[PDB]
Amino acid sequence: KRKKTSGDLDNYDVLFVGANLGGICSNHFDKDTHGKYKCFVSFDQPINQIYSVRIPYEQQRVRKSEYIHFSKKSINQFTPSEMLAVKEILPEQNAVVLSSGRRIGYNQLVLATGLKHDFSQIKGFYEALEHPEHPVYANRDPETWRSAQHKYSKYISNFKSGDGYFCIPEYPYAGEVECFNFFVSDEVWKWAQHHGALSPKHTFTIVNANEKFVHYCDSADAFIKERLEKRGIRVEYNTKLLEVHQDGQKATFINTKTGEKSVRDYNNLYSIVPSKRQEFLDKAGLTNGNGLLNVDHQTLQHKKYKNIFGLGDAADLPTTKTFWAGWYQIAVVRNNVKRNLQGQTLNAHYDGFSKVPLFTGHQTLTYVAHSYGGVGNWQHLKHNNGGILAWMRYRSWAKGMAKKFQDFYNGARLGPP
Amino acid sequence: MLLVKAVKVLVMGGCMLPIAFGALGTGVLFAGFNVALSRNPEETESLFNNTLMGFALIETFIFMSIGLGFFVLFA
Amino acid sequence: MLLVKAVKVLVMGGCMLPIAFGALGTGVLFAGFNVALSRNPEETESLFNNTLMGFALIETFIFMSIGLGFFVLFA
Amino acid sequence: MLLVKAVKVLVMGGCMLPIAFGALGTGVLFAGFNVALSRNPEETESLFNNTLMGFALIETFIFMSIGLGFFVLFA
Amino acid sequence: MLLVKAVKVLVMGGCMLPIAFGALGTGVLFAGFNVALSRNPEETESLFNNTLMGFALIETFIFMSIGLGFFVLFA
Amino acid sequence: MLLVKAVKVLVMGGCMLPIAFGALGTGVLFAGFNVALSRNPEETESLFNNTLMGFALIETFIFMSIGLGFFVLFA
Amino acid sequence: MWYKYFSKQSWNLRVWRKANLKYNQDDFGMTQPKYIARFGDFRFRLVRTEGALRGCMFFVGFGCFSIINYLYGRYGYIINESSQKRAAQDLLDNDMAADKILFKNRVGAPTRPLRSLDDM
Amino acid sequence: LLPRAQFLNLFKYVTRHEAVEPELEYSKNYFFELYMASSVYNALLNSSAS
Amino acid sequence: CIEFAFKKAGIPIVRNFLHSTEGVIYGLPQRVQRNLAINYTVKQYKEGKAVSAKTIKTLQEAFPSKGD
Amino acid sequence: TKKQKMEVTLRTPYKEYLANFDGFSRITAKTNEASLVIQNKTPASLYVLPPGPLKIRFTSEVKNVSGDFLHTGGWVIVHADNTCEINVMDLFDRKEVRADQFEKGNIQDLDTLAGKYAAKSRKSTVRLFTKATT
Amino acid sequence: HGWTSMLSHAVLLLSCYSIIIMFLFILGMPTLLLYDFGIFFLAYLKGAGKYISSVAEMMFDYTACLVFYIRILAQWIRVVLMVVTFISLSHYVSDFDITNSALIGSENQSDSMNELNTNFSMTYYILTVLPGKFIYWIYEILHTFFVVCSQFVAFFAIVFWLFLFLYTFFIIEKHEDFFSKKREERKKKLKELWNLKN
Ligand SMILES: CCCCCCCCCCCCCCCCCC(=O)OC[C@H](COP(=O)([O-])OCC(O)COP(=O)([O-])OC[C@@H](COC(=O)CCCCCCCCCCCCCCCCC)OC(=O)CCCCCCCCCCCCCCCCC)OC(=O)CCCCCCCCCCCCCCCCC
Ligand SMILES: CCCCCCCCCCCCCCCCCC(=O)OC[C@H](COP(=O)([O-])OCC(O)COP(=O)([O-])OC[C@@H](COC(=O)CCCCCCCCCCCCCCCCC)OC(=O)CCCCCCCCCCCCCCCCC)OC(=O)CCCCCCCCCCCCCCCCC
Ligand SMILES: CCCCCCCCCCCCCCCCCC(=O)OC[C@H](COP(=O)([O-])OCC(O)COP(=O)([O-])OC[C@@H](COC(=O)CCCCCCCCCCCCCCCCC)OC(=O)CCCCCCCCCCCCCCCCC)OC(=O)CCCCCCCCCCCCCCCCC
Ligand SMILES: NC(=O)c1ccc[n+]([C@@H]2O[C@H](COP(=O)([O-])OP(=O)(O)OC[C@H]3O[C@@H](n4cnc5c(N)ncnc54)[C@H](O)[C@@H]3O)[C@@H](O)[C@H]2O)c1
């Protein structure tokens, strides 16, 4: 019946930059308008790892097929796609130039470039993460690993002895609460000390470059720091990982507060991949300070260049950069963008809702729900100390969530509401 | 009562029907995996993975049937 | 009572249905293994390995039902 | 009592169901042997040795059914 | 006796099921022998012997059923 | 008694099952013979003889079935 | 010079106590799942291998099955005797109701059970 | 021109152009002759004309 | 058969076409007959060791085979 | 990336008949297994044609060619860019068949494993050519 | 068994014991094979488990151990066919027709010789009925030969040959290779004698 729109055009009326969240919006943007518009999508990476199930994945509760998804799947068939990153953006002309060089015009622009991982911020990190034996671990799997490599699942298991370091980069970074696995490791490593699998002379410290774990929610961060001390874990703030030596297992840390760098032997190193601001967004005069998009906190519309929007992680929003937060940010963009093409007003406001689970134990978790003002809902930090209630919620997220991201990309299942 | 009870255990037996088709369905899947391998054995790991995956989906139905069985046997 | 028992023994007989499909399912898997072998007899090892592995899953369902049979027969 | 006996014998008849499928599975297995043989007769021995092996497993289930057959008929 | 004898003779009718599948397995086997013969007629006698040979494995189940048939028909 | 006679005539009907499978088996046999002839028409006479021969084996099951039927119908 | 004639191709395995130590138990078997709890971890920690564990549970299973089968014979009436007395009188109540509504011919044979639904 | 051994190992990877009328085991060796004879036949003409 | 002629025997495709036309060379016009001709010389190269004349072209002379 | 409707090339080591032609509508030949038909949009594939007949339909009559030939053997390749090339050892028309001139001294063969297939093929082509004339 | 006819009151004594010996020692062959594997015997049969539950695998391991024996015991039904098929032939031969009409100068005058003996069978007896009895005879014996010859092979080819091909093997790796190098050195020591062509 309907024919697939053309991709070999000079300009469009809507343009999405991103496939993880920029694809879910496009697929949602068409069904809301019934395909009255021709929209183009342009991502950079071919694969989208489901970081929302990263911890169940490290527990091998989620197979590699249910954790690895291609970017094409998120985008529908009607809308064309091309894996070329934007080389520059000219809001004054309402156009976008790609790496190849083909100028493309637009009427409304949606940016979902999020936070780009930069392994080069830490010398020798990627080369040690790719080694199938070295005890250096990270938050995502490199693209060189095949289906037979399961090094990701050996961070907690293969910690027989030595000094362990869980490093957190400088904010802004991706995976604030959905990649914190220092509560499950403690429970698993508490058993190893009981029957001798883990040497008694070991050291585990959390190297947090930032001053607080959760920046836009004081209730959650206060709970974390409260629980970390109750467990007996040590932390070091203002310190960020700088270099990793794969030969002698040396980790170079630096205290940004004092500027004093040190070298520490490691035997099990985990780090959340650090992000990096993209210059093409700063050269166009769109980001503000840190490098995030300067957009409205309610409508997500950019301050200047009203024809441009922004959501996901690249947006500067006083909230936790989660995925469920994206579910409420795509429903707003598809609404406002629908109103800009019709000249109508923008009646869609984003409340700042964000929902991400915090794994408090090997098989227990609690949801970190909070709005813009850090105010939590009925689910905020409930059944946190374990129990039958937290046990069931854990199984619902590990054994029943990865099977849902297939529909989200297909379109069979939309957001929560 | 006993009549409805007789049908309950009777349905419980019917669950062995997919078990039969699951056996036949497995032979066909692996028979193709063999032929698919002799054609181009360069993709052992690939074809092999795709094989077991499909088989896993089959056991889903098999377990689903048995689950339906005990359920209807007591509900 | 007596009839429910009569149905139980009958359900036990129904277990011989996968036994039938397992024979056909086996002949098919070994039929392709022959052809798959003649097409590329150099790779006897890999193909042959996949045959028995597939056979295992096939017979696995066979005895699974037999277990289910005696279960319903006494439970 | 007399009823379950009439059912016991009735189940024993069902044991001839795999006896039927085993015949069909054979014609299919031997058909693949001929085509596989016509394809590459130089490797007959290998193709052949695998044939009887498969068939051995085929009628094994057939005998297995007869076992359960007489069991339920007398147990 | 007469009641069980009625189901006995009925079970004996079940033995005519392999008689059906044995015919189909035959039609399929000779089909493979013919098509396989065309592709490589150089080994006609070889294929021919294996054809009838395979058929012998078909009437195996046939006689087995009839034997098992008359047996339970009187045992 | 009277029912034993009724099941006997009922079994006699069961003999029409191989008559059904023999028809399908025959069509399949000639289906392959057609394609087989097109592959190597130089030996049409050889393929043809093998075609009817296989069919003769099919009618064996047929005569075997009705024979059993008329027997059980009168014995 | 026996090591001169030793073939290093036997280093493919490291056999110790009838087990190869170069076995990827982290990717295959009952030991692959990393979501195992405190009990399952302490169980594998003791035996170090699923092949040895399965071997011992093979015999320990018959012990438990043969024991619970005895306790259910000796004991058991403590929890099921009520359901047996229930089905006893129930089996007599329905029998007594059958004789009331059933066609008995000149001999005591229910020759017309299909007379109606209640008779069936 | 690459030798026979290198040609066969390279030809087996052929999957875009189907070869089922003659099976790949036969086609690989046949088209090798065409690949080799074509160059030889062309070379002789150029040299003979020169 | 072109396939088995190469499998069970080292008969190249070109030699097969030659043997194929061998029986029909006279039926074909003289234009084609002059094309089906192979005559050259092969020497094992010392001053005068060997001088082989390749003229048969159908047997194990130009295109050797396993059967020969 | 892609090519126009189609292009066919029929070449022979001693003469080139069609360097590139687009008027033809369909091609049919006989392979070892069965007869095939190659026309526009035919997917990529390789073929090897024994010494059989080759018939090709022309939308516009081409000079000096009849459209019906008997080749002694050739290779066929259908490139990815919707292009098929026919290369045969030699080509001629049926009108120049000159039947009944076969078996004129080349009947003698050698009893070997290779001579067996040699005679086998020679007989197969004879029966083919005899039918091709009809 | 002919040479054992006078050794006892049962001509088939040595045969009735051997079928039992043949059964018990074949029954112990798999049991001794598991003892040889050791405590890991279940991995030798089924391989690596799938579920973390030991109770779950416990059931899948009982099946593999049962199947391990069923492959053996289920083959004794082949011996039942060979016996049943052999007895049916003896029953047909021992009950085959023999009368005074085939005897030369019979003295059994009381065995239907002086009685009126008609029948209700087809006439032309030696052309119609008597051949048919021989036709069935040829079927009983051809069906017997084909059965006993076939079930005999399938029994030993499955109980011993195939059974041991599945659960046993030989390694290709070696631990010591000192014959290969000693033969080379020895061949240089005898180089002069070989030059004389022995
Ligand atoms: C009931 C009738 C009884 C009849 C008489 C019986 C007599 C028996 C006598 C002998 C006793 C048995 C001996 C058993 C050992 C034998 C040897 C052996 O087998 O090896 C060890 C073996 C080890 O097991 P395993 O297979 O290795 O473990 C599995 C995984 O490895 C484990 O993996 P994991 O370790 O990694 O993690 C496990 C778990 C995580 O585990 C945990 O985290 C739990 C740990 C908590 C520890 C808490 C400690 C508390 C402190 C102690 C007390 C302190 C006192 C405090 C003060 C008190 C003051 C008074 O994670 C999970 O999520 C598990 C999956 C989800 C649970 C599935 C359960 C399904 C059951 C459904 C039944 C529903 C019934 C509801 C009814 C409720 C109300 C009645 O032990 C057993 O097998 C136990 C026996 C199991 C038999 C099961 C048979 C029954 C099947 C289900 C029947 C369902 C009910 C039917 C009736 C219903 C009627 C209403
Ligand atoms: C009516 C009767 C019907 C039944 C008839 C049955 C007749 C069958 C006869 C079969 C022959 C039996 C003879 C067995 C000889 C055993 C000799 C021996 O001891 O040598 C050891 C030998 C094992 O040594 P290995 O394999 O050479 O090497 C060992 C590795 O080096 C070791 O490496 P690893 O160090 O890493 O291993 C770790 C450890 C792992 O061990 C574990 O799994 C751990 C278990 C947990 C322990 C509890 C832990 C509690 C922790 C509490 C912690 C609390 C602390 C709390 C904190 C405290 C704080 C202060 O492994 C072990 O050390 C244990 C291995 C020895 C287990 C012995 C199992 C066999 C017992 C059989 C009992 C039957 C007796 C009667 C026999 C009757 C004969 C007429 O045992 C065997 O090999 C057993 C083989 C059995 C094969 C035959 C199976 C026959 C199956 C029959 C059933 C057929 C069913 C189907 C029938 C169908 C119809 C017919
Ligand atoms: C201008 C016109 C002038 C002429 C016009 C008139 C022409 C004459 C018209 C005829 C009038 C009626 C004749 C009445 C007088 C009969 C007197 C007599 O001695 O009969 C005794 C004789 C025995 O009866 P019986 O002693 O009274 O016992 C009473 C019951 O049978 C007892 O009941 P039961 O059930 O207990 O008995 C068992 C039953 C058993 O059940 C059976 O009946 C067995 C049937 C199985 C065989 C059936 C197939 C036979 C034909 C196959 C040929 C087919 C070829 C074409 C195939 C095309 C396929 C589409 O019977 C027997 O066992 C009989 C065994 C003795 C016969 C076997 C040995 C014979 C030797 C044959 C060798 C032939 C070589 C050539 C020699 C020629 C000169 C002698 O009666 C007959 O058999 C009647 C025969 C009628 C002929 C049937 C058709 C024969 C076709 C042969 C074609 C080949 C030759 C072509 C010639 C073409 C000429 C144009
Ligand atoms: N835990 C982690 O480390 C992590 C990392 C990435 C994403 N996530 C999850 O993903 C959720 C949403 O992800 P997101 O949409 O905010 O960002 P993203 O990580 O999904 O990347 C944005 C998409 O646009 C592409 N992109 C980036 N720069 C581009 C450029 N110049 N040109 C073209 N394409 C470009 C990316 O390849 C990607 O397809 C987040 O809420 C978070 O939960 C987590």
Author numbering:
A (entry chain e): 27 to 443
B (entry chain P2), C (entry chain Q2), D (entry chain H2), E (entry chain I2), F (entry chain J2): 1 to 75
G (entry chain k): 1 to 120
H (entry chain g2): 201 to 250
I (entry chain e2): 2 to 69
J (entry chain d2): 24 to 157
K (entry chain a): 249 to 446
Question: Which statements did the authors publish about this structure?
Answer:
The F-type ATP synthase (F1Fo-ATP synthase) is responsible for generating most of the cellular adenosine triphosphate (ATP) from adenosine diphosphate (ADP) and inorganic phosphate through rotary catalysis. In eukaryotes, ATP synthases are found in the inner mitochondrial membrane. The type III ATP synthase was detected in ciliates where it induces tubulation of the cristae membranes. In this study, we present the cryo-EM structures of the type III ATP synthase dimer and tetramer with associated lipids from the model organism Tetrahymena thermophila in complex with the natural inhibitor IF1.
Refinement into a 2.7-Å resolution allowed for construction of a of the ATP synthase dimer. The overall structure of the type III ATP synthase dimer has a U-shape, with no other types detected, which is consistent with previous low-resolution studies. The ~2 MDa complex comprises 81 protein subunits, 9 of which were not previously reported, and assigned directly from our cryo-EM density map. The overall size of the type III ATP synthase dimer is substantially larger than its counterparts. The specific subunits at the altered interacting surface stably tie the two monomers together in parallel to each other, with little induction of membrane curvature. The total surface area buried between the monomers exceeds 16,000 Å2, which is at least four times more than for the characterized other types. Homotypic subunit-b contacts also involve bound cardiolipins, whereas subunit-f interface involves  protein contacts only. Consequently, the type III ATP synthase dimer structure contains by far the most extensive dimer interface observed in any reported ATP synthase dimer. Two copies of the ATP synthase dimer model were refined into the Fo-tetramer map generating a composite ATP synthase tetramer model. Both monomers are inhibited in the same rotary state by the natural inhibitor IF1. In addition, ATPTT2 has evolved a unique function as a platform for the binding of the natural inhibitor IF1 in a way that inhibits both monomers in the dimer, which was not observed before.
